[PDB]
């Protein structure tokens, strides 16, 4: 009841009881700063926890032997570790930490890494370097969070103290088990007490910007700061997603086994595939009913033009025909002591037999229980684990099938017996067809395309034509790459009559070397180019000459073109390998160089040619190697029916192959497996280790579908998790609100329990609002500007708007234009009357009412830059600039919003539905999740810049460049002149049909003579579409057909205000 | 003329939406699970 006595009037404001106000928000944010870290645990001590949260915490977490037997010093005097279980055991171990600590001043209980050990480590002691290595990597593992965990737990305690809520759609309360039935918080209380024990102040570590501090006790190990950040995510998601606690207990039990393990991160790396393997890879052993979508993609299949044509019910024959899972899924649990989890998952998975929202939410709640942490290891072991592997070529190409060198390039004779001639001819034809294009020869395009080692904390001048011919393969020869349209691909590929095969290439960077790929490619590009380009130079490299021994008869001189001169200078770079250089700040005295054959991680041109190399080898698989290496003419007939233009999609290493349904039903699911074995056999002959998968689902670009499902991965991103690669301090305070809004907008796209999710977003939003510098403080309207919907304001109905409302001025237009005749009543309801009537708010002084309630100051204060742009004195400059907006009193809104507010719309009648209600389109959303379920059916799911700004700025004002003057573009492009954009939230919906048809610019009773757009300045229609479709999406419930009603100043004088804003810029 | 947003108006929209969906002819007949006559 302590939180109740502390936060009485705020919880009723964000639970729909009382109206939200600025003074209650600021009086809460006054108190959010005034919390000790012990106060959160004092608040956790009072909640009565039920019997179904209690489970045995093991005693072996707290007693771990120290780190002396874990690390060693390699030759060349770099620190490593010796692995005990597996060669990938290179992560942070779990040992006793307290012996390497000396206490901070001003408080005795908390210590840090001692300065004598880092002094002797900089001096060059053997043990001290190991000790400071372990200390810095434990700090870096503990640091991977957005904010201190006690603030998140306190926001949970504030938000979930209002009890159950009420639904204005379902007209009933919700049934979600409260804090007494929440096992991660019981464990979070028990661990943090048992660490302290008799000692008070009870916070196992505190979090600062540069470094952490550890509680000085023998009970403290390194596994605890990732474990607590792991438990807080489940404690939040059990509330705001409506998870079943019978899955959350397994999700906590696996994390307790992870903390009890030899290492935490390594155990989670080895156990990250328990929940999808037992649940998602094993669905519907017996299928009896349910609805499935009916897509098809149109016949030019490279276009990826899709079409939704109704939904049909399933039949008995579309069960899981894929092979079994038990022999390895039970083995994974038996190796690690999780058979009580694996069998528990399998027996519960075997009870669902119909395809509806229930069995889909089962998959969502099972996938949510994986632990999303960020794996932390030193760069000096990241390199020497990742960059030391190599491909193995079981069938190399013989020395007879090469001639002598043309300079530094041997050519491949076409009478070879190996498969590499099919790789050779595609790159050869690609080079020969890109060299004949006229665009590659004017000097301006060469200047445009103009416009040693590498390390980690000049290849792009000479490696041009490799990339330039990779693009030709990706976009003209075999259009299998989709380099927004990935969704209907998988919704077709997951349908009942067709299957899908999830092909992934392991180690795409270590994949291709000079042994098989780069030699044939640099032999093909050196020959396809030299026909068209003879003597003509490139950008900056000249023509040249080099001797050859192509034919064995004689040798001669044979002048080099100049475009193949780069191939000459670049194949000697590819022939030897790459040179890297490292220096981790996590272990001193560790600074060396290293020679590999692998590629850099995240370059741009390293994706396109890998995609070309994917599609080419898949095409020669399906054409040549396929029929030549199999019996069983069902497999032969299956192979001879599909090609990569018709069914193969690849974007990186991974690919997706689709096997459509025949007339007799689905394809026999045993010949597909016989072809899978041939894919795995095919990869061994030239070094690729495929990660093929066949279960009945579709995985492409890490999106999970089953029967066309849109399953979100809740643990793809955690809530309290943030990546940190270096050891540097982070940005200052007023930029944390961008990540808090990121938490909210990432919770939008996943179908959380929306009343719970908005209510928890308010608690975070009010917790991150005040900072010492009079202190700085954002009012609650500054967050409403950032896209955060509200609950109950100005004396309205509770839970009245939706989080599909946009941000910015288009967002501020909509809810005001919906609530305005109630707001102008509430102003007069307490002494806010003036004599003149405004055309918007009437006889009430909106200026004084908004100044006293600080709505104006939030509106203009949210537009300040949160970036401390190029020192603490610049931070003080930004703070004074931010305080000046709060001290200044304001007169009105911006000219754009005031020009918007003259437009009035109407909600006549609801539109006919766009998709079936009983069809499960998307996971998590159902009639229990009422508002997205209404919006997505009423609208429909998406199943089908400075130049563009400024030329419209000069075109709409009175003034390609000859084309733009008279044409028009669509609404989403023409209405970017007033900086209006379709928001991030509407991307998974159909805004095109809504803009084109169901926003009418004409009243239902004809033409009111006030809404007369002139024939001149017809660009206004494209903005009135957005102003119409705002309120038709912000209002919760069904998206309604909306008609124009009134423009107060006239349609001619409406756009003159927009033209004044365009002159004022 | 104008109107504010009210839960009354929300329910008024939802009932019209469900009625216009319910009176669709494929929806009036189709079902997910076949019966003992259709299976025979």
């Amino acid at each position: 009841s302590m939180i109740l006595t502390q936060f009485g009037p705020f919880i009723e404001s964000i639970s729909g009881i009382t109206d939200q106000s600025n003074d209650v928000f600021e009086n809460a944010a006054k108190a959010f700063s005034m919390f000790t870290r012990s106060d959160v645990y004092k608040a956790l001590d009072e909640i009565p926890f039920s019997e179904d949260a209690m489970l045995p915490i093991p005693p072996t977490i707290y007693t771990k032997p120290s780190h002396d037997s874990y690390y060693y010093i390699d030759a060349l005097n770099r620190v490593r570790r010796k692995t005990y279980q597996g060669p990938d055991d290179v992560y942070v171990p779990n040992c006793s930490i307290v012996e390497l600590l000396e206490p901070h001043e001003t408080l005795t209980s908390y210590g840090r890494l001692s300065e004598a050990i880092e002094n002797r480590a900089k001096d060059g002691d053997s043990q001290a370097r190991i000790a400071t290595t372990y200390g810095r990597i434990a700090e870096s593992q503990a640091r991977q969070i957005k904010a201190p965990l006690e603030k998140f737990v306190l926001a949970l305690l504030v938000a979930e103290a209002g009890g159950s809520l009420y639904d204005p759609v379902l007209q009933k309360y919700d049934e979600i088990p409260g804090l007494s039935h929440n096992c991660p918080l019981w464990c979070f209380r028990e661990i943090c007490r048992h660490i302290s024990g008799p000692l008070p102040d009870r916070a196992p570590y505190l979090y600062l910007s540069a470094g952490v501090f550890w509680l000085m006790s023998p009970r403290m190990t390194s596994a605890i700061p990732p474990l607590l950040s792991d438990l807080v995510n489940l404690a939040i998601l059990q509330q705001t997603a409506g998870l079943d606690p019978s899955l959350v207990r397994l999700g906590v039990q696996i994390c307790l086994h992870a903390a009890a393990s030899s290492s935490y991160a390594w155990f989670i790396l080895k156990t990250k595939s328990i929940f999808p393997q037992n649940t998602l890879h094993s669905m519907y052993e017996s299928l009896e009913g349910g609805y499935c979508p009916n897509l098809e993609w149109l016949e030019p299949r490279s276009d990826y033009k899709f079409m939704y044509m109704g939904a049909m019910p399933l039949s008995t024959k579309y069960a899981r025909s894929a092979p079994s899972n038990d022999k390895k899924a039970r083995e994974l649990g038996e190796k690690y002591g999780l058979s009580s989890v694996v069998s528990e998952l399998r027996r519960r998975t075997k009870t669902y037999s119909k395809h509806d929202f229930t069995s889909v939410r089962y998959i969502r709640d099972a996938m949510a229980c994986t632990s999303g942490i960020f794996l932390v290891r030193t760069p000096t072991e990241t390199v020497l684990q990742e960059y030391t592997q190599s491909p193995e070529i079981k069938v190399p190409i013989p020395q007879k099938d090469w001639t002598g060198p043309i300079g530094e390039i041997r050519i491949l004779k076409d009478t070879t017996s190996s498969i590499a001639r099919y790789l050779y001819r595609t790159w050869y034809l690609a080079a020969a067809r890109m060299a004949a294009q006229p665009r590659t020869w004017d000097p301006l395009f060469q200047a445009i395309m103009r416009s040693a080692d590498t390390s980690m904390g000049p290849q792009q001048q000479v490696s041009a034509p490799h990339t330039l011919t990779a693009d030709y393969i990706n976009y003209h020869m075999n259009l299998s790459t989709t380099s927004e349209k990935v969704i209907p691909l998988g919704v077709y590929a997951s349908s009942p009559p067709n299957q899908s095969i999830n092909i992934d290439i392991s180690a795409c960077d270590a994949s291709i070397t000079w042994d098989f790929f780069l030699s044939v490619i640099m032999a093909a590009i050196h020959e396809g180019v030299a026909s068209s380009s003879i003597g003509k130079p490139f950008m900056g490299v000249p023509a040249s000459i080099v001797n050859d021994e192509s034919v064995v008869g004689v040798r001669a001189a044979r002048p080099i073109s100049g475009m193949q001169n780069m191939i000459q200078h670049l194949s000697k770079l590819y022939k030897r390998g790459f040179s890297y250089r490292v220096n981790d700040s996590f272990s001193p005295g560790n600074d060396f160089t290293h020679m590999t054959t692998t590629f850099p991680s995240g370059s741009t041109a390293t994706s396109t040619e890998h995609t070309a190399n994917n599609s080419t080898m898949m095409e020669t698989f399906l054409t040549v190697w396929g029929p030549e290496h199999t019996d069983d003419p069902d497999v032969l007939r299956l192979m001879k029916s599909l090609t990569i233009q018709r069914n193969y999609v690849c974007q990186g290493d991974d690919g997706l192959m689709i096997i459509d349904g025949n007339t007799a039903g689905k394809v026999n699911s045993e010949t597909i497996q016989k072809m899978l074995e041939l894919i795995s056999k095919y990869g061994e002959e030239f070094g690729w280790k495929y990660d093929i998968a066949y279960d009945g689902t579709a995985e492409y670009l890490k999106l999970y579908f089953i029967f066309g499902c849109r399953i979100p991965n809740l643990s793809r991103h955690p809530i309290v998790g943030k990546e940190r690669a270096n050891s540097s301090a982070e940005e200052p305070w007023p930029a944390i609100l961008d990540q808090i809004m990121g938490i909210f907008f990432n919770g939008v796209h996943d179908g959380l329990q929306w009343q719970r999710w908005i209510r928890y977003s308010w608690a975070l939003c009010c917790a991150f609002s005040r900072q010492r510098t009079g202190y700085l403080q954002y009012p609650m309207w500054s967050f409403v500007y950032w896209g955060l919907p509200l609950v109950k304001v100005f004396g309205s109905d509770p839970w009245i708007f939706s989080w599909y409302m946009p941000t910015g001025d288009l967002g501020m237009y909509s809810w005001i234009s919906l609530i305005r005749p109630l707001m102008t009543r509430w102003m007069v309801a307490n002494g806010y009357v003036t004599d003149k009537c405004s055309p918007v708010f009437g006889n009430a002084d909106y200026r004084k009412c908004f100044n006293e309630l600080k709505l104006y100051q939030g509106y203009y204060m949210a537009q300040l830059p949160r970036n401390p742009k190029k020192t603490r004195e610049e931070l003080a400059e930004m703070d004074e600039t931010l305080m000046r907006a709060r001290k200044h009193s304001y007169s009105s809104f911006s000219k754009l919003l005031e020009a918007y507010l003259l437009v009035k719309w109407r909600m006549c009648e609801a539109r006919e539905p766009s998709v079936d209600l009983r069809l499960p389109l998307c996971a998590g959303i159902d009639p229990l999740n009422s508002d997205p379920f209404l919006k997505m059916v009423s609208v429909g799911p998406m199943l089908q810049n400075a130049i563009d700004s400024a030329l419209l700025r000069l075109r709409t004002l009175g003034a390609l460049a000859g084309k733009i003057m008279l044409q028009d573009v669509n609404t989403v492009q023409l209405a970017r002149v007033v900086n209006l954009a379709v928001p991030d939230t509407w991307m998974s919906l159909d805004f095109d049909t809504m803009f084109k048809h169901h926003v009418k610019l004409l009243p239902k009773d004809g033409r009111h003579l006030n809404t007369d757009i002139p024939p001149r300045m017809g660009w206004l229609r494209a903005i009135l579409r957005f102003l119409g479709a705002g309120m038709a999406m912000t209002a919760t419930g069904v998206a309604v057909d909306i008609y124009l009603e009134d423009i107060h100043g006239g349609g001619r004088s409406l756009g003159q205000r927009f033209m004044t804003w365009m002159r004022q810029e | 003329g104008n109107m504010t947003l009210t839960s009354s108006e929300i329910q008024r929209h939802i009932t019209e939406f469900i009625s216009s969906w319910q009176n669709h002819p494929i929806v009036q007949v189709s079902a997910d699970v076949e019966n003992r006559k259709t299976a025979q």
Partner: peptide
């Protein structure tokens, strides 16, 4: 209305 939203002389006389 909110509750409803939850729910759903002499001669003249003679």
């Amino acid at each position: 209305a909110h509750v409803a939203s939850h729910g759903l002389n002499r001669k003249t006389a003679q």
